Every structure is written in structure tokens, then in C-alpha cells.
PDB file of C-alpha atoms in Angstrom:
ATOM      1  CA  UNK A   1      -2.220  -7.370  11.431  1.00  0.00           C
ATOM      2  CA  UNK A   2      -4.364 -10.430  12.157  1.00  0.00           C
ATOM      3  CA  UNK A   3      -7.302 -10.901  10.112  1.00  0.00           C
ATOM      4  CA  UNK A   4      -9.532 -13.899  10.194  1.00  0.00           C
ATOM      5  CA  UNK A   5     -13.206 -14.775   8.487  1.00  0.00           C
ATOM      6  CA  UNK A   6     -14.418 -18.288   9.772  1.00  0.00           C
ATOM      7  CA  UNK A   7     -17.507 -19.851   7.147  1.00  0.00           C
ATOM      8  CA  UNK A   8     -19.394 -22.183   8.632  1.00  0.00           C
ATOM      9  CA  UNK A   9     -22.655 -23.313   6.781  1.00  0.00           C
ATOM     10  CA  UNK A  10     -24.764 -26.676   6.587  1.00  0.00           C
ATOM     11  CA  UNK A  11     -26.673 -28.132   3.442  1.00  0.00           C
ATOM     12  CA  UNK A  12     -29.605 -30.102   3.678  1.00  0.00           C
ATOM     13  CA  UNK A  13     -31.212 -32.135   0.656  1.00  0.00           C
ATOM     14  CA  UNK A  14     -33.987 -34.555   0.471  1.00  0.00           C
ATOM     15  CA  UNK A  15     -34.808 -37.085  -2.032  1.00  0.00           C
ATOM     16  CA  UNK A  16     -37.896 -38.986  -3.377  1.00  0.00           C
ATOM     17  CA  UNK A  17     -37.635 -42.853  -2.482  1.00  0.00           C
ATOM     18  CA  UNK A  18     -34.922 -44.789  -4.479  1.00  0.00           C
ATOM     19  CA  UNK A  19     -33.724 -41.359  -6.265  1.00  0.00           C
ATOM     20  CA  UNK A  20     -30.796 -39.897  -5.675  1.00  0.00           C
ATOM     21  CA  UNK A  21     -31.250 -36.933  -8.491  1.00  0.00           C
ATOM     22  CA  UNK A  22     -31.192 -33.338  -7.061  1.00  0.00           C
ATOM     23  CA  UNK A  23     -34.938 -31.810  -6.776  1.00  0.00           C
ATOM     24  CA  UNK A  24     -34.896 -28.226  -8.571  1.00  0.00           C
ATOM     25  CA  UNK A  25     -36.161 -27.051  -4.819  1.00  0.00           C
ATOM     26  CA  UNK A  26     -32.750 -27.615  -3.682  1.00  0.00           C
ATOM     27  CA  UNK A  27     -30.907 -25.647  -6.379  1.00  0.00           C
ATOM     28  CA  UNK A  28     -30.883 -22.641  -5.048  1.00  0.00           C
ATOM     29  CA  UNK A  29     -29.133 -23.545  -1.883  1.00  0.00           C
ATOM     30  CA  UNK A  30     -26.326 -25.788  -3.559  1.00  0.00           C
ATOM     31  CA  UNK A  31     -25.719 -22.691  -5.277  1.00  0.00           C
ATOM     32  CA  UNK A  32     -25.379 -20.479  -2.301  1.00  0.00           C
ATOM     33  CA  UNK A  33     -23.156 -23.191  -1.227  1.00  0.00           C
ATOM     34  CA  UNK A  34     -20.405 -22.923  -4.130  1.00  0.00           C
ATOM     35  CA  UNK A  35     -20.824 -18.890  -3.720  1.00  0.00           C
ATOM     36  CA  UNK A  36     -19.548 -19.417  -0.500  1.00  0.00           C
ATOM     37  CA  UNK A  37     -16.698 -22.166  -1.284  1.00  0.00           C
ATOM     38  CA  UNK A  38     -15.717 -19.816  -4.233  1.00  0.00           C
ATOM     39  CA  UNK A  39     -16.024 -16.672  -1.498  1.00  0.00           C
ATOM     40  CA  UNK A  40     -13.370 -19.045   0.888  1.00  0.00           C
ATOM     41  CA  UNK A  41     -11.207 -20.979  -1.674  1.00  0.00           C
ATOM     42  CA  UNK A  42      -9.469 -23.427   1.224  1.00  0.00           C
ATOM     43  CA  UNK A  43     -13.226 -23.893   2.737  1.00  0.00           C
ATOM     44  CA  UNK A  44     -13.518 -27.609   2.465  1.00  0.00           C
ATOM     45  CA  UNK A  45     -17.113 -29.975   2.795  1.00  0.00           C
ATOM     46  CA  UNK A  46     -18.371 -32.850   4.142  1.00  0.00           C
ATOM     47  CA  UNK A  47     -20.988 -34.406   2.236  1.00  0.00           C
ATOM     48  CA  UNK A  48     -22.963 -37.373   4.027  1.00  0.00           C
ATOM     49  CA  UNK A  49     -25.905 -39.456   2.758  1.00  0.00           C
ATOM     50  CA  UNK A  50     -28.622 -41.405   4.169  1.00  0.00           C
ATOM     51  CA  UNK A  51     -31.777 -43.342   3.693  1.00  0.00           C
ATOM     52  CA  UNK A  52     -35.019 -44.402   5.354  1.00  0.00           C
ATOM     53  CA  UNK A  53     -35.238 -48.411   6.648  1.00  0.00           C
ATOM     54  CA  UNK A  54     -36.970 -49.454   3.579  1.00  0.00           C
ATOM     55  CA  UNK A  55     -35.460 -52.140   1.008  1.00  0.00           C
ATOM     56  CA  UNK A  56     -32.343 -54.416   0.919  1.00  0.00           C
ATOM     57  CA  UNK A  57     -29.247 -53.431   2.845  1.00  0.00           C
ATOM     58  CA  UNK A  58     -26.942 -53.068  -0.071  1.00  0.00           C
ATOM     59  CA  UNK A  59     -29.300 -50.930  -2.333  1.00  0.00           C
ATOM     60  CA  UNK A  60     -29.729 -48.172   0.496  1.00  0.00           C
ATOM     61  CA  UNK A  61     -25.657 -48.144   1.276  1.00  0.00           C
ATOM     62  CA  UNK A  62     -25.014 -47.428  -2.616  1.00  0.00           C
ATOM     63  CA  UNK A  63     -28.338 -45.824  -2.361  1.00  0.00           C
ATOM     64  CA  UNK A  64     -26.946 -43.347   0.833  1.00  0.00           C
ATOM     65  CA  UNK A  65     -23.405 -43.111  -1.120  1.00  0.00           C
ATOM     66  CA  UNK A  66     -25.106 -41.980  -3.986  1.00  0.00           C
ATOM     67  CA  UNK A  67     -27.189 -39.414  -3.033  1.00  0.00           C
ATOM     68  CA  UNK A  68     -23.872 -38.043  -1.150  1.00  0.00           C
ATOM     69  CA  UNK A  69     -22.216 -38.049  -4.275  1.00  0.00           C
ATOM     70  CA  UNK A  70     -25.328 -36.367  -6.569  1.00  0.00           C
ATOM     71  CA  UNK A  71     -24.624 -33.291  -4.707  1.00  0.00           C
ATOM     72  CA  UNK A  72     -20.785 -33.194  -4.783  1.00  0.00           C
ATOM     73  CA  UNK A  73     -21.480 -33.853  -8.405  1.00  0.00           C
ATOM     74  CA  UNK A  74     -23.599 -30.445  -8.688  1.00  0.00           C
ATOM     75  CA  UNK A  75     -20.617 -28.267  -7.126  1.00  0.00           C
ATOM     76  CA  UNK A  76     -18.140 -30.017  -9.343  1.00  0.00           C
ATOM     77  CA  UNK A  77     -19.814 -30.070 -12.807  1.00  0.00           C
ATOM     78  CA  UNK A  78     -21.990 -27.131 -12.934  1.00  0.00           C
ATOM     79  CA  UNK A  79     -19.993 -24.731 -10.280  1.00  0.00           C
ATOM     80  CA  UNK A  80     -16.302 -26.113 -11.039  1.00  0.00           C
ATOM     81  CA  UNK A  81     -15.678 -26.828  -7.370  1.00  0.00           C
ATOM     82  CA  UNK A  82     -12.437 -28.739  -7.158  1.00  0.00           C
ATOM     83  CA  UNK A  83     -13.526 -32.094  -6.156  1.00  0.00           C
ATOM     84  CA  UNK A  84     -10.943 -32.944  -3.734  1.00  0.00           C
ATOM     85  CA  UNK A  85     -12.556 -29.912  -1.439  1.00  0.00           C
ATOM     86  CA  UNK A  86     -15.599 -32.351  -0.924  1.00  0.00           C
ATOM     87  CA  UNK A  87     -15.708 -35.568   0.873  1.00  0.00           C
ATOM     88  CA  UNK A  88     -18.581 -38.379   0.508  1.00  0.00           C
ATOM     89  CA  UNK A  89     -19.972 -40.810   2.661  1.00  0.00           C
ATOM     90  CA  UNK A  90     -22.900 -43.400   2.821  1.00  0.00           C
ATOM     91  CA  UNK A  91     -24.249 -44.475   6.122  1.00  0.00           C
ATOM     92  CA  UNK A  92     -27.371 -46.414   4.858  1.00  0.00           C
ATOM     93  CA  UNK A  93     -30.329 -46.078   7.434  1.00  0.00           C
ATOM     94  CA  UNK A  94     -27.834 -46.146  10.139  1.00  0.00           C
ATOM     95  CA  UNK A  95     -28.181 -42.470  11.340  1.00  0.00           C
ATOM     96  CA  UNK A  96     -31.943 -41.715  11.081  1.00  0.00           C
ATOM     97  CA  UNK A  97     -33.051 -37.976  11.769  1.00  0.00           C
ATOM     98  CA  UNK A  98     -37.053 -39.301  12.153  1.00  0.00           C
ATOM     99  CA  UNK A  99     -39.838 -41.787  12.320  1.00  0.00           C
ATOM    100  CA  UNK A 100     -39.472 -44.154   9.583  1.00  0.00           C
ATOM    101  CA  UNK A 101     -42.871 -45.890  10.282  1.00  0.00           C
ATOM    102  CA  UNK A 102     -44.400 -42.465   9.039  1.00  0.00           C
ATOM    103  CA  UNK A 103     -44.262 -41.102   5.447  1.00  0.00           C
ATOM    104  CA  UNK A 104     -42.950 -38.265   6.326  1.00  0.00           C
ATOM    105  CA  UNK A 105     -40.249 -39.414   8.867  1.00  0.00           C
ATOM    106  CA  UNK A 106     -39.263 -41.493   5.967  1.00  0.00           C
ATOM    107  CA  UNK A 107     -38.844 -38.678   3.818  1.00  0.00           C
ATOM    108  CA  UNK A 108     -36.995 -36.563   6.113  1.00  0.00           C
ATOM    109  CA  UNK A 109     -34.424 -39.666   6.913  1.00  0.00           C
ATOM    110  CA  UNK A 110     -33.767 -39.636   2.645  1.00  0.00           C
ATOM    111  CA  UNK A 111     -31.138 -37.014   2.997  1.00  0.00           C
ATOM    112  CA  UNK A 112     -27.962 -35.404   2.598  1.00  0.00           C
ATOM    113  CA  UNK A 113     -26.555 -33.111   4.835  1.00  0.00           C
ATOM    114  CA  UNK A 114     -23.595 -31.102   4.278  1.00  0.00           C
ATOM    115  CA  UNK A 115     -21.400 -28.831   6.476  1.00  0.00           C
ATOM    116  CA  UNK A 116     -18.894 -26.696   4.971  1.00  0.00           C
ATOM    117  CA  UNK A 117     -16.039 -24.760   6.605  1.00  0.00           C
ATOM    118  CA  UNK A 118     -12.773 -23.105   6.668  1.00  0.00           C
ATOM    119  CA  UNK A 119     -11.663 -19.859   7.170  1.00  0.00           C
ATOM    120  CA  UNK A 120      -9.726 -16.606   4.971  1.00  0.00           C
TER     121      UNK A 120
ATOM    122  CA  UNK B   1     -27.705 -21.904   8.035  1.00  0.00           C
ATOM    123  CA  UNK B   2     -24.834 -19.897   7.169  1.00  0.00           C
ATOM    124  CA  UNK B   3     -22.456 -17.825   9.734  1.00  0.00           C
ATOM    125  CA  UNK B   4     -19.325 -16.069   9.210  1.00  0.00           C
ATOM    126  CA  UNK B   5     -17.293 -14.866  12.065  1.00  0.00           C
ATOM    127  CA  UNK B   6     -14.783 -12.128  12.303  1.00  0.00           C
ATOM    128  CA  UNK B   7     -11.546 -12.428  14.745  1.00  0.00           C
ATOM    129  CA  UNK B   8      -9.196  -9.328  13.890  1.00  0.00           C
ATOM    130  CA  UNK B   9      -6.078  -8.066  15.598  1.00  0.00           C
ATOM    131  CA  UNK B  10      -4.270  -4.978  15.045  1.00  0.00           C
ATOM    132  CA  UNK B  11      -0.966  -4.145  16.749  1.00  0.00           C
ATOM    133  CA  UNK B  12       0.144  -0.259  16.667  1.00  0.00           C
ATOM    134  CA  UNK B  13       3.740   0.170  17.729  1.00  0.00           C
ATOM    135  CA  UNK B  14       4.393   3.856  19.479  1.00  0.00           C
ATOM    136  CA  UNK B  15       8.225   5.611  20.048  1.00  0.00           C
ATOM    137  CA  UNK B  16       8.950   6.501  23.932  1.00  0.00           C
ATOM    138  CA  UNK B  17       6.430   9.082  25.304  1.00  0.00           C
ATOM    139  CA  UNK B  18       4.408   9.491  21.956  1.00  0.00           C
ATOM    140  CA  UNK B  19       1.112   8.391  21.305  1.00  0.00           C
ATOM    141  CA  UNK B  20       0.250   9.253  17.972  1.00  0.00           C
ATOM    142  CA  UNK B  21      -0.188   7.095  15.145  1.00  0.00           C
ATOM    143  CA  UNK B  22       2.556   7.089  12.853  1.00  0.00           C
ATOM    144  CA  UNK B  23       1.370   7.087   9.470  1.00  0.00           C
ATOM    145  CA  UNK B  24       2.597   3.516   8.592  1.00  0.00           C
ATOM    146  CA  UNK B  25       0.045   2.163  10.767  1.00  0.00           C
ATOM    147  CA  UNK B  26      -2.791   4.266   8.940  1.00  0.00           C
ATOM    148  CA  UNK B  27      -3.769   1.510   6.205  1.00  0.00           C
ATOM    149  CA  UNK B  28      -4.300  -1.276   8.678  1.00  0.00           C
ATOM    150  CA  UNK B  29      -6.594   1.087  10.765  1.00  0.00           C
ATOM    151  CA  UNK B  30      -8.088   1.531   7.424  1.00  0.00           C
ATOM    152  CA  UNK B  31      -8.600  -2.180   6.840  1.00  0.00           C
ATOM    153  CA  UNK B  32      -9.946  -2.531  10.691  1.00  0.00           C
ATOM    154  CA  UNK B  33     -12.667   0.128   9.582  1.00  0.00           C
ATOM    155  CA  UNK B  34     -13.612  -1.452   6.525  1.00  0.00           C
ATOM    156  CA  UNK B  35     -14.217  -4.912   8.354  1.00  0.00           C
ATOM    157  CA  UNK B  36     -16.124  -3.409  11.343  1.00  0.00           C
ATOM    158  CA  UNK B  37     -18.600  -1.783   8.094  1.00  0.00           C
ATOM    159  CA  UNK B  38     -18.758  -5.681   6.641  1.00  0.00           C
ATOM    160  CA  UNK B  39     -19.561  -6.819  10.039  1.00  0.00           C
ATOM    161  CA  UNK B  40     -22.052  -3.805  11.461  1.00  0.00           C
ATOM    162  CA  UNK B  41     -22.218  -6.103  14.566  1.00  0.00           C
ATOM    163  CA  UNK B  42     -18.941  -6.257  15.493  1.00  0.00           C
ATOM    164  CA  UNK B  43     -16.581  -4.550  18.469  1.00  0.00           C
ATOM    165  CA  UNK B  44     -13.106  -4.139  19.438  1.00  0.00           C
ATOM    166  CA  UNK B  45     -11.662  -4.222  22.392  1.00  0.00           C
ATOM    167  CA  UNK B  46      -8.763  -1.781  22.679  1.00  0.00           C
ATOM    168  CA  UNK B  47      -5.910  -1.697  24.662  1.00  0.00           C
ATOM    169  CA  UNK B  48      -2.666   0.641  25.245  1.00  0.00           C
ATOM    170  CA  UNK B  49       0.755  -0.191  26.897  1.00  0.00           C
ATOM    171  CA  UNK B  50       4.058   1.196  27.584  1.00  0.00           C
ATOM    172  CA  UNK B  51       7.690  -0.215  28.355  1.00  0.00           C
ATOM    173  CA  UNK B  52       8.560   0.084  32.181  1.00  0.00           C
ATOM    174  CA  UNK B  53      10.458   3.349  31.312  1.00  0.00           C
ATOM    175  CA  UNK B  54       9.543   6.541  33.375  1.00  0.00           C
ATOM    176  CA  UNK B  55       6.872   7.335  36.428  1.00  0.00           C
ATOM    177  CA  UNK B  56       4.276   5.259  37.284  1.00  0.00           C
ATOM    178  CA  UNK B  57       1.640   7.976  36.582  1.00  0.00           C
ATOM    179  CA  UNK B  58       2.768   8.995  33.086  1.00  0.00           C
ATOM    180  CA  UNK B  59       2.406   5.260  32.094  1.00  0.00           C
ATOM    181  CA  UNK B  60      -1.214   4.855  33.388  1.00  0.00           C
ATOM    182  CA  UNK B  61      -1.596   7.941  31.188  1.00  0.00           C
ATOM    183  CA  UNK B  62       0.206   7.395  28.015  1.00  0.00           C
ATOM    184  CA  UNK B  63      -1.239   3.883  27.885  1.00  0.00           C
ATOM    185  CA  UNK B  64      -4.833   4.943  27.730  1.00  0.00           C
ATOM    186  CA  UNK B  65      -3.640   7.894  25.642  1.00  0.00           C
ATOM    187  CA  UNK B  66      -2.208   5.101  22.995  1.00  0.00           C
ATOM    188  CA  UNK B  67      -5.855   3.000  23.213  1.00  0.00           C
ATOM    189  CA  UNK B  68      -7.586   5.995  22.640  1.00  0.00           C
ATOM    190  CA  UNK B  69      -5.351   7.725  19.230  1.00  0.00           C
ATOM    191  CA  UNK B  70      -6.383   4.593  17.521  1.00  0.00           C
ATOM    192  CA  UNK B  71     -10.406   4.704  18.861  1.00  0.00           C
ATOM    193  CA  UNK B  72      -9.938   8.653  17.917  1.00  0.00           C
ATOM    194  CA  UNK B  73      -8.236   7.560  14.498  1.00  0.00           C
ATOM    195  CA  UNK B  74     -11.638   5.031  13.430  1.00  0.00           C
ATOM    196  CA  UNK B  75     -13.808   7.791  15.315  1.00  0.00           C
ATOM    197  CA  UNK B  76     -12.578  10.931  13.487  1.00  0.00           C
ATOM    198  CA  UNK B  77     -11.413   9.811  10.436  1.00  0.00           C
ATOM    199  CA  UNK B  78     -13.271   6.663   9.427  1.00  0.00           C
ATOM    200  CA  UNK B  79     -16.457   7.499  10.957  1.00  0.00           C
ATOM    201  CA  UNK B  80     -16.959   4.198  13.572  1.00  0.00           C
ATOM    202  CA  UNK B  81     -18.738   4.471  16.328  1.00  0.00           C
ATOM    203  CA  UNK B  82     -17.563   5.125  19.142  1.00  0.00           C
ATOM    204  CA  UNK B  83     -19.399   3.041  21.520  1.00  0.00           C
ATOM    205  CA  UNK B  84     -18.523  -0.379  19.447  1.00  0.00           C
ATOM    206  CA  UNK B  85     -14.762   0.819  20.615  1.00  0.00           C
ATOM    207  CA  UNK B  86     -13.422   0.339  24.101  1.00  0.00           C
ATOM    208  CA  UNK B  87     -10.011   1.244  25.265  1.00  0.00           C
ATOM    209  CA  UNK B  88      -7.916   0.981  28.272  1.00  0.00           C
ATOM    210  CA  UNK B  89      -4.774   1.138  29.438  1.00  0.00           C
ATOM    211  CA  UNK B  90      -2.480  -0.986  31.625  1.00  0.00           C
ATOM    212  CA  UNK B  91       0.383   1.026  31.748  1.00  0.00           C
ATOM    213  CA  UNK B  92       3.616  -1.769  32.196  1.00  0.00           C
ATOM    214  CA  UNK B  93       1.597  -4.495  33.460  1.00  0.00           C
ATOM    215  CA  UNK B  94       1.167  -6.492  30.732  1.00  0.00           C
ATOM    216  CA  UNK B  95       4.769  -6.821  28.916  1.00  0.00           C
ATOM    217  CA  UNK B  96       5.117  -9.039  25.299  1.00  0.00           C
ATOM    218  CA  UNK B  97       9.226  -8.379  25.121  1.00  0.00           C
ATOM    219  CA  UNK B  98      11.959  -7.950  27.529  1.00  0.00           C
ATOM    220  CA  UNK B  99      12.394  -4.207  28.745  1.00  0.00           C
ATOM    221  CA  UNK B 100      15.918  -5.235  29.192  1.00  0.00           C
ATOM    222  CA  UNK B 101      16.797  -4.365  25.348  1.00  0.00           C
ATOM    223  CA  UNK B 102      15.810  -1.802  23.170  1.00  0.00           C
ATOM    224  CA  UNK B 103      14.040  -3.894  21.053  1.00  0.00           C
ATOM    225  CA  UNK B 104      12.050  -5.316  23.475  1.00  0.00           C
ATOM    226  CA  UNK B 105      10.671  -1.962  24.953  1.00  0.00           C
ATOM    227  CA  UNK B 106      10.230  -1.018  21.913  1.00  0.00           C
ATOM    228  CA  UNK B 107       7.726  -3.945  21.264  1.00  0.00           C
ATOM    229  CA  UNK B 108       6.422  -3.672  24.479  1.00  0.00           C
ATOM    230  CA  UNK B 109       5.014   0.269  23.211  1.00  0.00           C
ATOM    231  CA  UNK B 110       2.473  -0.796  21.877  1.00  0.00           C
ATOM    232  CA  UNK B 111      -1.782  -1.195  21.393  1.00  0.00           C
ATOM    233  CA  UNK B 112      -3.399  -4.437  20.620  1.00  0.00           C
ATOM    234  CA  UNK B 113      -6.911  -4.203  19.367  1.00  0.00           C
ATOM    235  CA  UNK B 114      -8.992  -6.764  19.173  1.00  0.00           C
ATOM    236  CA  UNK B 115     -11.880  -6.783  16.659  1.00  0.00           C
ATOM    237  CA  UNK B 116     -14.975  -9.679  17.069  1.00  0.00           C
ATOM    238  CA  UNK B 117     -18.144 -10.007  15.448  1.00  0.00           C
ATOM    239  CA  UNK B 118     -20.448 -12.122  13.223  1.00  0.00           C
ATOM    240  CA  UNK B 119     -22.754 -12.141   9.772  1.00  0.00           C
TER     241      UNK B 119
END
């Protein structure tokens, strides 16, 4: 007998200008996310940050890196996800989602989006 | 977004000219029924075979008769229904193992189900 469950989910997070904290709004959903990576143990995630255009190169790459790392840093501390299941990565305001000459384009380019798989 | 996909396959082995299902095989038809209740959505695709062995017309039959002892088994006993279940036979069309040997007839008696759906 063959038996196979694929998991396949995505994560999105959005953070106030130069923040890279995790808003209460979004608590709920990085918890659904370590159900899940409890639910598959050898699910993995990829965990990639971004900013809007605004500000000095350097402070939105840490800035991006940051904010990629502020979420792997909720599963890990207070869901005990084994870090080495999540991978982070910055790409500054290289891979914008929206306007960034409106308020709100700007706030939907500061982001993280995650997408976990794997299967059981 | 979340999604979580099923892919399931269950392999029921048969002796020459039998076509029911020997008790051995009962807790994996018991696992297939418990997945297709986690995954309401979800159907199988069921199909019977036989080793070259014997006419051409009690093949065709005993095929379909081995495809539909393990529908009848999740039917009758684990209360699936029926429609989510297909079954056909292809008599000794479609071998896995060399009908040469013993073993490989033997391997070649057989019904592959397939089980797909998503949650």
C-alpha cells in the first residue's frame, strides 16, 4: 500500500514601515502554519522578505532579511519548529508585489511571504 | 491558502480463478476507507487483472469480478459510496510480472486501486 498526503500552504505577513515585529493580526495564521508543519514533520518552508523603495539600500536588505527572519523566529521560539526546516531570504525592494508611489502599494510591498510543503 | 492532496494506491493480490479478498488484504481496504472519509472529495479508480492463464472470456470476467470484490468490500462493509468507486477489468492486457514463472503470474493476479482527492 501506497499512501501519500502532499501540504502545500503559503503565508503572507505585512509590516508597518521600518518594523519588522509580527502584528498580532498575523498570529493566528503563523499558528495555523506550525499546526500544519507539526501535522507533516519533514514539511519544510521558505521564508522570503521584502520592502517598499523607500530609504537607503542597505537598511531595506537587512530590513527585507529581517522581517524574513521575525517570522521564522515565531515558529521556532514560541511553536518549537526546528529551525533548520525554515529557510530565510532578503530581496530588498527588488521583487515588488504593488505601486510603491501609493501608500498602500507601499504597504503591500512590506512583506513576507512564505510557502510551505512536503508530503506524509 | 492551504491544500492537501491525497494520492493512494492499494494493490490486492488474488490465487488462480478466485476473486475474493483474502483476509490479509482487509486492513489496507480499511485504511483506503478511512482516507476516502478524511478526504469526502476523493475517488478511486479501480482496476482488476489476471495472469494469461485460461480462456479469454473467463479473464474478461474474473478481472472485473476482482475490481468489483474490493468496490463491494468499501461498499458493503465500510459504507463508501459507490459512485466515488469505479472498476474495470482488463483481463491479461496489462501484465506487471512475467507469466513465464509462478511468481510472476502470481503478481500479475492482481487489482490496483487508485485513490485521488483533495482538502
Amino acid at each position: 500500500m501506497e499512501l501519500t498526503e502532499d501540504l502545500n500552504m503559503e503565508l503572507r505577513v505585512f509590516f508597518d514601515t521600518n518594523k519588522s515585529n509580527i502584528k498580532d493580526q498575523y498570529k493566528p495564521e503563523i499558528a495555523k502554519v506550525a499546526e500544519k508543519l507539526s501535522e507533516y514533520p519533514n514539511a519544510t518552508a521558505r521564508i522570503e522578505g521584502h520592502t517598499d523603495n523607500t530609504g537607503p539600500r542597505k537598511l531595506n536588505e537587512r530590513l527585507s532579511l529581517a522581517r524574513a527572519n521575525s517570522v521564522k523566529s515565531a515558529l521556532v521560539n514560541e511553536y518549537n519548529v526546528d529551525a533548520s526546516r525554515l529557510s530565510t531570504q532578503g530581496f530588498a525592494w527588488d521583487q515588488p508585489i504593488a505601486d510603491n508611489k501609493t501608500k498602500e502599494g507601499r504597504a503591500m510591498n512590506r512583506r513576507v511571504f512564505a510557502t510551505i510543503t512536503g508530503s506524509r
